[PDB]
Amino acid sequence: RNRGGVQRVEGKLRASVEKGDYYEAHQMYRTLFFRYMSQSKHTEARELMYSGALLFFSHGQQNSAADLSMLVLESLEKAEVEVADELLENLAKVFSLMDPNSPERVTFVSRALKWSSGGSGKLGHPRLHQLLALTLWKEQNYCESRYHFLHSADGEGCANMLVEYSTSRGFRSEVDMFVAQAVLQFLCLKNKSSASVVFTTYTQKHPSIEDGPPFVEPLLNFIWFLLLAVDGGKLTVFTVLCEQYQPSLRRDPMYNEYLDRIGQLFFGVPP
């Protein structure tokens, strides 16, 4: 008896959902979630919120679905559930279903990334970043997709998306710069393997770029040699390459700054 209230509440929620009282169903969902979390039935509450969010998204109840997804994040955080690939997939699926211009996605993402192995930092978990980047790329949100890719670890998809983005928007004179910029940014972080794979993929696949490591474009050759040097980590080689290719690096001033970080990150440049 003392607990039959929850069951009656759940039954009433089912009846309301059948009737289509979507807002009332959302309120009932919130109440059930809070009660379950009171009893530490974290998994059940998370599953219920996930199912409800999917249901509301199916019916276009964007705001209610977003709120229930936020509650899913609350359940994951308060229960301190260790990161799991399936949970990342579920979160990415929910994030895909949201409205791109609705600010909640940002509010969601910042939260989700924070939960995903918060110890690492704002990077969250690279797997989730890759999933978000893939979703954005399928939605043609090239700016944010590139951002997440850079924070991701999926070099190949990043290269493919960059190729599409360049062929779409970039000018004929910028084709290399994109990848170079990306590569340089990938080295602003400690992800050198991502830089290598993305550069190789961009060079091979991009139609406007001729194949062969000895590239015609001076900038591509410079990036290739810089990758080799970072593999060798020789400061003298890095300085030689920087000095020789100064006109090319001047094509975008930001490159300079990246190099500095790279010099600190891979050649012992003083802080």
What is the Cα–Cα distance from 133 to 113, expressed in whole angstroms?
13
Question: What angle in degrees, to the nearest 10, is found between the helix axes of 175-188 and 192-205?
Answer: 170
- Tell me which stretch binds another protein (CB under 8 A): 40-48, 79-87, 139-147, 199-207: 139-147
Residues across the chain: 271
CB of 252 to another protein, least distance (A): 7
117 binding another protein? (CB under 8 A): no
CB 245 within 8 A of CB 218: yes
CA 230 to chain centroid: 26
Return the sign of the alpha-carbon dihedral for residues 52, 53, 54, 57. Answer: positive
Q: Which of residues 36-55 bind another protein (CB under 8 A)?
A: 38
- Tell me which stretch binds another protein (CB under 8 A): 39-47, 84-92, 200-208, 244-252: 244-252
Contact pick of 84, 208, 210, 240 for another protein (by CB under 8 A):
240
What is the Cα–Cα distance from 210 to 215, expressed in whole angstroms?
7
Identify which of residues 138 and 169 has a Cβ nearer to another protein in the complex: 169
172 binding another protein? (CB under 8 A): yes
Contact pick of 17, 48, 53, 61 for another protein (by CB under 8 A):
61
DSSP 8-class letter at 2: T
15 binding another protein? (CB under 8 A): no
237 binding another protein? (CB under 8 A): yes
Q: Which of residues 195-224 bind another protein (CB under 8 A)?
A: 214, 218, 221-222
CB of 26 to another protein, least distance (A): 6
Identify which of residues 134 and 262 has a Cβ nearer to another protein in the complex: 262
Residue carrying structure tokens 């999917």: 54
Q: Which of residues 143-162 bind another protein (CB under 8 A)?
A: 143, 146-147, 150-151
DSSP secondary structure string for all residues of 199-238: HHHHHHH-TTSPSSSS-SSHHHHHHHHHHHHHHHT-HHHH
Neighbours of 103 (CB within 10 A): 9
CB of 145 to another protein, least distance (A): 11
CB 248 within 8 A of CB 219: yes
Contact pick of 123, 153, 227, 265 for another protein (by CB under 8 A):
123
Identify which of residues 31 and 200 has a Cβ nearer to another protein in the complex: 31
Identify which of residues 110 and 193 has a Cβ nearer to another protein in the complex: 110
- Write the CB contacts of 95 (distance below 8 Å, at least 6 apart in sequence): 69, 105, 108, 109, 112, 132, 135
Look at residue 191 and give its three-state secondary structure.
coil
- Tell me which stretch binds another protein (CB under 8 A): 56-64, 81-89, 152-160, 200-208: 56-64
Identify which of residues 33 and 50 has a Cβ nearer to another protein in the complex: 33
247 binding another protein? (CB under 8 A): yes
23 binding another protein? (CB under 8 A): yes
